[PDB]
Amino acid sequence: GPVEVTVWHYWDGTNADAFDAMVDTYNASQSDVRISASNVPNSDFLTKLRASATSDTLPDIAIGDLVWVPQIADIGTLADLNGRIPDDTLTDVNDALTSFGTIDGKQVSVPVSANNLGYMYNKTLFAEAGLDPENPPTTWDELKAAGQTILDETGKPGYDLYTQAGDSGEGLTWNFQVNLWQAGGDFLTADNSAAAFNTPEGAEALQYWVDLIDSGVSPYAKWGEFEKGQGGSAQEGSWMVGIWAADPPFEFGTAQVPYPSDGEPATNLGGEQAMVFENSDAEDDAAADFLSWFLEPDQVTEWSKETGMLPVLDSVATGSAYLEWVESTEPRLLPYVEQMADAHARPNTALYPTVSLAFAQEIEKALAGEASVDDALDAAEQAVNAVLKNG
Numbered sequence: 001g002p003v004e005v006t007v008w009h010y011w012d013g014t015n016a017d018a019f020d021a022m023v024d025t026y027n028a029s030q031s032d033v034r035i036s037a038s039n040v041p042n043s044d045f046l047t048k049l050r051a052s053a054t055s056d057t058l059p060d061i062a063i064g065d066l067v068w069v070p071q072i073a074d075i076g077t078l079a080d081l082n083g084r085i086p087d088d089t090l091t092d093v094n095d096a097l098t099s100f101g102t103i104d105g106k107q108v109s110v111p112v113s114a115n116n117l118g119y120m121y122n123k124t125l126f127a128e129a130g131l132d133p134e135n136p137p138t139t140w141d142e143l144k145a146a147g148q149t150i151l152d153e154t155g156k157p158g159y160d161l162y163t164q165a166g167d168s169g170e171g172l173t174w175n176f177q178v179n180l181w182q183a184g185g186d187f188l189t190a191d192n193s194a195a196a197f198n199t200p201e202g203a204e205a206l207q208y209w210v211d212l213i214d215s216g217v218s219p220y221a222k223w224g225e226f227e228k229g230q231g232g233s234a235q236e237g238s239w240m241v242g243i244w245a246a247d248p249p250f251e252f253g254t255a256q257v258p259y260p261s262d263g264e265p266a267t268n269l270g271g272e273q274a275m276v277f278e279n280s281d282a283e284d285d286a287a288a289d290f291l292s293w294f295l296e297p298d299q300v301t302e303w304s305k306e307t308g309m310l311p312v313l314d315s316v317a318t319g320s321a322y323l324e325w326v327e328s329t330e331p332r333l334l335p336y337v338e339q340m341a342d343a344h345a346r347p348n349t350a351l352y353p354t355v356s357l358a359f360a361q362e363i364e365k366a367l368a369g370e371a372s373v374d375d376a377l378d379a380a381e382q383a384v385n386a387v388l389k390n391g
């Protein structure tokens with residue numbers, strides 16, 4: 001009988017139905033491996049893995065959020081996927097995501113879905129303000145000026161900023177990182193040992209946020225006005241194209257995230273990564289056989305099409321097949337697809353969640369008007385370095 005391989009994931013809905021259909025397809029396509037997939041709730045997933053390490057009942061495959069990988073790598077020994085998944089598959093996978101998935105030299109994760117942040121806007125409100133509803137802003141200066149027009153002409157915020165840290169800080173941090181990278185900035189140093197953002201580039205990105213808030217274009221603590229149909233625009237994840245293209249709350253448009261004339265295009269990557277917990281070389285190779293099949297172009301194309309998630313393979317994101325389909329079926333996803341070339345991943349440190357909250361709490365003081373841009377970047381660097389240095 002087949003090698004039995006367990007997969008834990010947190011997908012629900014369409015995504016879980018799609019994944020179960022692909023498991024069925026793989027299971028019926030050969031007799032050497034049988035995949036048994038289970039849903040574990042997103043909020044329960046890490047705590048289940050910690051208990052499972054203690055009870056020696058870890059799954060063979062875990063599929064987790066990007067920022068979980070480094071934490072999971074400390075819960076249980078992860079197999080190296082290099083030499084298990086075909087070299088040409090791993091080369092094709094988005095480089096930011098294979099780099100992210102490299103811990104102690106081993107390819108301990110591979111992405112199996114992707115998403116990124118984009119610019120979404122309300123065409124009806126743009127038109128009401130006297131803007132061209134088909135011509136979104138392309139630069140920071142264009143966004144500030146178009147947002148100012150929306151505020152001046154309609155009394156509504158031109159652009160939402162994610163300005164409150166909340167429980168994790170990640171809404172603020174991961175929206176800010178986009179603009180830090182577009183300014184030519186870095187978040188941590190290349191070895192994740194220290195902050196790298198307390199720079200002219202960092203101050204350019206934070207001064208952008210503070211200028212938007214100070215003008216009233218992006219009020220402090222007013223996230224979600226855009227989503228209510230009461231706001232010009234917002235950074236939104238690619239998953240929103242799918243949620244809205246079905247039952248839209250208003251006529252929305254999408255674009256590349258506006259970037260500074262003195263800078264470069266950038267965005268931030270989300271999505272799910274697969275990890276194989278090390279057992280025997282036979283069992284690791286059984287698990288990696290399923291992941292190899294899952295990462296072939298035909299699977300990645302059909303999976304992306306049906307879930308609205310962005311493909312993890314460069315060859316699919318840039319392929320005529322997939323692009324023609326996006327143009328025919330979900331054309332507002334195209335800017336998100338094109339951004340896969342410029343997208344960055346967060347740093348692969350196991351302290352990232354603590355780093356991100358320490359960062360977000362200090363930066364929020366500048367957004368709230370309680371600190372200067374220079375003092376908040378100094379404070380954020382102190383908080384982050386204390387978290388990184390002291391472990």
Ligand SMILES: OC[C@H]1O[C@H](OC[C@H]2O[C@H](O[C@H]3[C@H](O)[C@@H](O)[C@@H](O)O[C@@H]3CO)[C@H](O)[C@@H](O)[C@@H]2O)[C@H](O)[C@@H](O)[C@@H]1O
Binds near residue numbers: 066170171272
């Ligand atoms: O962009 C606003 C968002 O920012 C933070 O979350 C960052 C994570 O966003 C992604 O996860 C999203 C899923 O893809 C969606 O299908 C859905 O469940 O929403 C989550 C985020 O809530 C990304 O895949 C992750 O890698 C990112 O870390 C805030 O914490 C969120 O509250 C905001 O929604």
